[PDB]
Ligand binder design. Sequence first.
Ligand SMILES: CCCCCCCCCCCCCCCCCC(=O)OC[C@H](COP(=O)([O-])OCC(O)COP(=O)([O-])OC[C@@H](COC(=O)CCCCCCCCCCCCCCCCC)OC(=O)CCCCCCCCCCCCCCCCC)OC(=O)CCCCCCCCCCCCCCCCC
Ligand SMILES: CCCCCCCCCCCCCCCCCC(=O)OC[C@H](COP(=O)([O-])OCC(O)COP(=O)([O-])OC[C@@H](COC(=O)CCCCCCCCCCCCCCCCC)OC(=O)CCCCCCCCCCCCCCCCC)OC(=O)CCCCCCCCCCCCCCCCC
Ligand SMILES: CCCCCCCCCCCCCCCCCC(=O)OC[C@H](COP(=O)([O-])OCC[N+](C)(C)C)OC(=O)CCCCCCCCCCCCCCCCC
Ligand SMILES: CCCCCCCCCCCCCCCCCC(=O)OC[C@H](COP(=O)([O-])OCC[N+](C)(C)C)OC(=O)CCCCCCCCCCCCCCCCC
Ligand code: FES
Lengths: 230, 53, 297, 61, 66, 149, 154, 40, 149, 89, 231, 62, 102
Amino acid sequence: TKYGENISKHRSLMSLYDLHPQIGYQSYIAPNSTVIGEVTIGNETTVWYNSVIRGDVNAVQIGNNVSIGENVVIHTAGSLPTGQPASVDIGHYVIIGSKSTIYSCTIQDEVVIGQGCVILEGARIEKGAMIAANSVVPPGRLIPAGTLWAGNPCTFVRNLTKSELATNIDHAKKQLHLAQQHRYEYLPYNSAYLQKSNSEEDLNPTKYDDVTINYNFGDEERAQENPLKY
Amino acid sequence: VKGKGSIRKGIHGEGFGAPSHAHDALIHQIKQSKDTMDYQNITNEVAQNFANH
Amino acid sequence: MLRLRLFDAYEKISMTFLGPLYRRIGKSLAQTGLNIQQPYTSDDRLVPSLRNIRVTNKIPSINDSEFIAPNSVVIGDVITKEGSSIWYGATLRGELGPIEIGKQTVIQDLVNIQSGKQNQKTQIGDNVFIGPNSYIQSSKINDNSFVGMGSTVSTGCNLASNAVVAAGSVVPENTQVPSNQIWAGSPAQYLRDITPEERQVLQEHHQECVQLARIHAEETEKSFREVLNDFDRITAEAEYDHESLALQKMRDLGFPMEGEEEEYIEQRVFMREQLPPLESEFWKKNYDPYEQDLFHF
Amino acid sequence: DFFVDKYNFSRRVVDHRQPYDLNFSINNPVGSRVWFKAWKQKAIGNFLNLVGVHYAFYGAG
Amino acid sequence: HQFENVLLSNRKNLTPQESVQKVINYALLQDAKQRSRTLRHIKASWVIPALLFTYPAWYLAKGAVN
Amino acid sequence: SQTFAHDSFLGGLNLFKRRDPRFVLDQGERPPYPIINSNSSFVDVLSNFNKADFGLVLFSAAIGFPLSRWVLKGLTFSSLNYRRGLFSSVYGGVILWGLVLGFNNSYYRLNGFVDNGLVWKRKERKLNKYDFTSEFEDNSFFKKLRIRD
Amino acid sequence: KQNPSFIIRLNLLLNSLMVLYLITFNGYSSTFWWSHFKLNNYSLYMYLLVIIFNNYFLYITEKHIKILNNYSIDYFFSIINITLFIPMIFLSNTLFTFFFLIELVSCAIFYKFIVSKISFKNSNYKDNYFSIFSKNYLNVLFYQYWSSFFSSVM
Amino acid sequence: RQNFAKNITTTDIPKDSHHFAAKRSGFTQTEQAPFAYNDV
Amino acid sequence: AGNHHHHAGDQADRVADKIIWINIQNRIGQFERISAFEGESLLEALQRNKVAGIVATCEGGEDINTMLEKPIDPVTYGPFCSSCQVVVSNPWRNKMGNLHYLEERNLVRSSYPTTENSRLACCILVEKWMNEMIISIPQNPNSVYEDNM
Amino acid sequence: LYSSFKSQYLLILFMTILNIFGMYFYIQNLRFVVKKNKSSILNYKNYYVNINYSITLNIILLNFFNFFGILFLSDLIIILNYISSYIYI
Amino acid sequence: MKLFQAMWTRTIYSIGRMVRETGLALDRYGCKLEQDISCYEPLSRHRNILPIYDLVPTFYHSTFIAPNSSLIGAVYLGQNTVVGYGSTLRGDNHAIRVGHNTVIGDKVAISNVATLAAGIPVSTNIGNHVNIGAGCVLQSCVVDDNVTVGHNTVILEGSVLERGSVIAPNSLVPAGRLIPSGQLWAGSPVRYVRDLKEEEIKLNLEQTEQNLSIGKTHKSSLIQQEAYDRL
Amino acid sequence: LLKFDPFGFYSPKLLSENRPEEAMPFYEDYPQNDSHWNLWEQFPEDFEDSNAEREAILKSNK
Amino acid sequence: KLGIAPIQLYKIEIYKGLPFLSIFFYTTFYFLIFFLFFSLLFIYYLSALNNFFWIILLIISIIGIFYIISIIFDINLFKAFLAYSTIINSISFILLIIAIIF
Ligand SMILES: CCCCCCCCCCCCCCCCCC(=O)OC[C@H](COP(=O)([O-])OCC(O)COP(=O)([O-])OC[C@@H](COC(=O)CCCCCCCCCCCCCCCCC)OC(=O)CCCCCCCCCCCCCCCCC)OC(=O)CCCCCCCCCCCCCCCCC
Ligand SMILES: CCCCCCCCCCCCCCCCCC(=O)OC[C@H](COP(=O)([O-])OCC(O)COP(=O)([O-])OC[C@@H](COC(=O)CCCCCCCCCCCCCCCCC)OC(=O)CCCCCCCCCCCCCCCCC)OC(=O)CCCCCCCCCCCCCCCCC
Ligand SMILES: CCCCCCCCCCCCCCCCCC(=O)OC[C@H](COP(=O)([O-])OCC[N+](C)(C)C)OC(=O)CCCCCCCCCCCCCCCCC
Ligand SMILES: CCCCCCCCCCCCCCCCCC(=O)OC[C@H](COP(=O)([O-])OCC[N+](C)(C)C)OC(=O)CCCCCCCCCCCCCCCCC
Ligand code: FES
């Protein structure tokens, strides 16, 4: 009854009455991925398949040319004990491994998060730091810039060299062409609607609304930069 | 909260501004004790207004 | 006369003739183009709804739930009580074993419940919280239990009421978690005893998530026409001005919205009496004007 | 006709967004009885609102 | 002679070391074939625009400067 | 042979056929065609209306529908009555512009600027000393848009 | 909240019709209406050039408005008046008529400045209960008004 | 950085697989796992 | 890397022990307390905490040869406005020291009244010794039309 | 070139002074154009940045003409001289 | 010539794409003229099998592929391979190859790195009877036959697992390391535990067989309920 | 300096350039010469590169 | 009226207070009509008075150049930059007009 239907009612982008997500140019959000709430995505940012990003409880900021990964859940907290803003902030060239969970945190530029990491609320990862795949950053913990940490709880290993930082930046830049290759496979016009069957509601609306404005106003002049656009 | 922009509701009530913004004592007083003033309390704002005048 | 008649005639002619013709031509061209592009192309598909999947007579009973994410997976013998919430990407494979979810039990994103045994059941009590990326295999979770982000509960585990598992904690197989105790680490071990403030904040977080589940359900469960109206409203608000917003609020309150109605303004703005104060407002302990608490300053 | 390999050539969803004044008497073709009734009401109302303006304009013309 | 899918073949008789080595070699060979195919497709994508639009560009430049 | 008959419904197309790219003739230059009435008043100009002017008005009416719809396509938050009224206003404006064009064509025919069906007894023939367009027009489509003695 | 795209399109349409009239124009080179206006090739070419440039700028403005709407219908009505009355200046045959035409165009430009949008619905939620003073509108009006006064009197 | 493919098909890379040997028995609970590739 | 005293196997320090507290008197006479970090500008900290009373028209200034560099490059253009002024209490103002000539130019060119303790948040760089620093933030002027947007 | 044709060496000098000062006035902004990261200056519509194909096309035509105006300048000069010749001055 | 064939393939593909574009645009314009809102409907564009140009996933019809899953690029599945719900095999930069009777758990993510050192394949290869639990992450790793990987396990680049090796759940295999045959390894950095017994091997074999049977039952039920496309 | 030997003539050089350490990804060592004047990958003349796996699977599927 | 270098600060203020679209239209109107007619006053309309206009134009141009040479490098606003670009072009065109009327 409530949940009985054959066609899924899932949308990648959603808002809660005031919280419209914003996505930059050349940014690919996978159809499986869900991005709901006050979420801002920068330019060339790629969110892979089956990743959830909820900015409903608080704002979420995502930098430019970052990779989020697969099966990654990013969400905010109501507040922090220190009184700091609880919004999620991620810098540029940040790579987040798959299976990872991000709480209200502050990730700076060129940070690399391994696969399956768990960063808890209040964590502050500085520029260039790296995290082992199966490590946990406890709440309110500061990871210094250009340092390597591993384990659960995370513990220091050694400092990172300019070569390692350059390699991380290069990988972040390299993800972009794969994202574009995935993007090119979708046409700007969705053809799924052509596969449905007319229903009574479709053929005769129950109630009518007053024509105010079409959301696709001027789309005959707008460029189809992102094929996955409503 | 529906129709209030970035304002969000807490456990015991709904805030009067965006999350990271500062709470306003004058607005709190207006809401809680609307139209009622036992005495003309001289706050920092009142003192500064007097000085400016 | 002539001009408006020509306008109406052209509108009818277009809507009745050009619309269908262009539609048919476009569909034929789309089919031809897809055929040409094959086998190196894919076309959009009607993604199946995997909520409430029946396997070998096992029918999920989830109708008494507040929020079920549209992209979640619920298969087989999955029973959920009133107020339970299952969020995006959660997979509940109940065919491996029965999956019982209590009242007001929250399961966050990408949470997978799979019984490692052939028919062992998974039982979750009321007011239980399971965070994102959690993995419960088969265990007895009592009421008011908390499971952190990226936490794994192994087979045969039993955690009692008011037992907290820290995020990123792997509970060893066949482990008992007493009440009002915090277990953290990998392998998980007892750390300390839950303080009243920690318990209060955990309860507040659980209540906040339960309430947010209602908003998520309201957003997700919308018709196509309602979603189109929401898109139109957002686009209109992108250009609405302060005067338009003020007019919206005024019409919601009930102010006159027409010139002939302007003469009865006083009946809607001033004549209406103000609601008397609640009697509870007369019992406040203190009435001193509010000021910021300057502790720590 | 109704269906092809995957595309429904008869797919149709009616646009629920229609102007409020659709089917109003004034919107009927000029010269009809319904249109004349609506226009007469509109003209009477306009004259009542502005007796002086209607005079100065129509009588002068 | 005939194509054999080493990954999908039966390697239980061989020792684990030999099995993994054969799998690695087969994977390397198939990856090389895929690399050649994708490189050829990229080369075709390079060649097509040149042949199609070289003469038009020269025509435009010749008209502009002469 | 180069211009449409001034008495035909297509006689209004001679406005686009011009001997030279100038706007107006010099003060003293003889008009290309005999003058019918130099000091023409409004009443006589209206009386001189012709099938060419009627055809210009018909062209304006025919072309005002696509243009009116094009203008209306940028309209939002509009009721049906207001949309129809705006369409009527734009179409009437286009038709009035057509009427103005017909009036100007009648004035030109009266003054001899455009082909009025008459020809001077002795043509004043130029010497085409500078010729950058004769061969181009002959080998191109623009020979239709120019008038040569 | 009606978008002014239709007003801009109407302005473009009537400008194009005026261009057609200029293209089809014929007559003698002389002055008309009491020698207050000059009708010659150079003046008509200036008129046509002004009209063409106004048409192109109106097209670009229409595209921008379709992109985003922060301008009211009165703004583009003022632009319409300016476009209609400004090319007539080059047809002036006397300094008197030139002065009157430029005064009319100045009034139209002052109207355009008056109808400038003032308050925006931005993302700043910190000034809800505080007074913020911006003098740009008054400065524009003051300087335009007084420069016009000085120029007109001189 | 460099993006070329190491595994070329024009010829087989000369190698010795006997200088380094991977341990496969007698491990402890504190010893790290061995390395899969040991060709020089 | 560097600027830390961690050895292999050590636990990360708490952000609470590293946050530098700034106390502010808001434009409305109330008191606020925010947290910042060393290495980021006071303007960045104030904007992150969303403190009212600062317009920041230039939004920190240029991205190269910035005023935040401890040795200020002589080829620096300095601040591009004076819309982030803050009055700093004498104990920390004396530690901050004399003003850069460009910063003083902008401060004096500010349209609103200025104080001898006034300074630009973008030009201020957060330091450890600034802990518990007390400042006041009156309302700053609005420069151009784009501020309202 | 026209100033030289009219034999105005002082006018050429002042024109050159103004030209070089204005040239640096325009050029100095290229220094500010440098940014630490890539900016986000596009309006968001339907949850995505709004890029206008029509304005991009107009900018492309303007860019082409800005780059290759020298090639086609003879035609524009001819047209402008033709327009100005009607003036008898 | 192969180059000419590739050029012709690209040309015909581009022509087909342009034809699709024009057809869909005509359909939308017709809907606009007809006052139809069918086109505007936002429907998930997720495609279970997403082929990159010249890289089409291939799988035997006997395989069960979860509709929630996503196979992209050069992916190769065996006879009765099972892919769990929500698991994604990106395999876009390089190929992903799977065995005849392997099981991939729900939410499993497989993606291979751009490049590796000489002699190390940059593609994921999995044995015939491998069982991979839900929530596992794999990157350019080689797995032999009869290998069980516990749930929430991370396997990095250049990591080779021999036949019969078992990895406990909640453990990570460091990149470029070997897991010998018949041994149990556990811990976030894998550490030697013990040598497997015949009883454990039989239990693992039975578990993977049961998983394959469960996958067959899921495929049958989904086909019955119209949630599975009859390929 | 005595140990330094990027090439494998004196000190043996692994085909895998480096030994990866735990908690770090496996990346190739930066080469001594970083010249980018590299051609597209070269293959033997008449190299067989048909998608044999795909062809076999399609044939089996029928 | 125009806002030429001697009297330019009001133009700077107007540009600061105007929207970008208003500047877009105003620059077009100004340059294509007002300044063109200003030039035609000396070239075509009042050419008989060039024996007096030349010295006034030269003095105005010199004063404006020497007054803006330093001011144009003191601005810190986009609107000011646009306005001063317009002013510099106006001064250059005035010099060209002097050369023409020579
Ligand atoms: C002297 C002092 C000045 C005053 C004199 C009198 C002027 C009268 C003018 C007309 C007034 C119309 C009514 C206005 C009422 C207002 C009050 C009102 O209703 O309020 C509510 C009204 C809203 O309600 P509404 O119902 O929606 O609108 C009212 C009506 O319902 C709907 O509104 P509508 O406007 O759309 O409807 C008007 C329609 C009303 O509709 C009807 O009643 C039915 C339609 C009837 C059509 C009649 C057409 C007749 C044409 C005759 C042509 C003959 C030519 C012959 C050629 C020669 C042949 C041989 O009436 C007309 O069609 C009038 C046209 C008359 C043309 C007469 C031509 C005479 C030419 C003389 C010279 C001849 C020389 C050559 C001679 C040769 C002889 C050999 O408020 C408004 O917003 C109304 C706004 C109207 C604005 C009008 C002004 C527009 C122009 C502004 C220009 C600004 C300056 C810039 C230009 C500079 C110069 C002007
Ligand atoms: C060396 C220095 C040189 C400096 C050059 C400075 C200027 C360069 C940039 C601008 C040049 C003009 C570009 C064309 C206009 C812009 C609009 C347009 O056509 O594109 C939109 C439209 C985009 O269509 P879409 O993307 O399919 O859909 C758009 C919307 O969805 C749906 O669109 P919609 O429905 O909203 O509107 C469709 C309508 C939109 O079109 C418009 O509304 C046009 C707007 C501009 C009007 C003004 C044009 C004036 C042309 C005369 C020359 C002066 C140019 C001044 C330009 C700058 C002024 C500020 O499209 C058309 O019909 C386009 C026709 C364009 C040709 C107009 C010719 C008018 C001639 C009138 C004067 C005749 C001489 C009289 C002699 C009198 C003697 C007594 O473009 C096209 O359809 C074609 C685009 C690609 C080819 C463009 C070819 C341009 C050729 C330019 C030649 C320039 C003169 C020769 C060179 C001179 C120097 C040697
Ligand atoms: C910058 C500003 C804009 C540009 C500059 C502005 C220019 C200003 C100066 C314009 C002068 C125009 C004078 C024209 C006089 C001749 C008119 C004409 O052709 O008449 C021919 C005819 C006469 O033609 P005739 O001259 O041939 O007749 C005489 C003929 N003989 C000599 C043989 C006997 O005129 C008339 O009969 C009517 C005269 C006018 C009657 C009163 C009309 C009042 C109209 C008021 C406005 C109505 C608005 C209605 C709107 C309806 C819709 C809403
Ligand atoms: C030998 C016998 C010869 C017989 C010849 C008989 C025929 C004579 C008439 C031929 C007319 C040819 C076409 C003219 C232009 C049609 C324009 C049109 O309908 O476009 C609609 C279009 C309307 O748009 P649209 O209909 O293309 O669709 C818009 C669709 N969207 C909005 C989604 C993009 O008009 C415009 O867009 C123009 C807008 C600006 C205004 C321009 C006004 C131009 C006025 C031209 C008047 C006629 C000049 C004729 C010159 C003849 C010279 C010889
Ligand atoms: S932000 Fe402008 S000077 Fe500080």
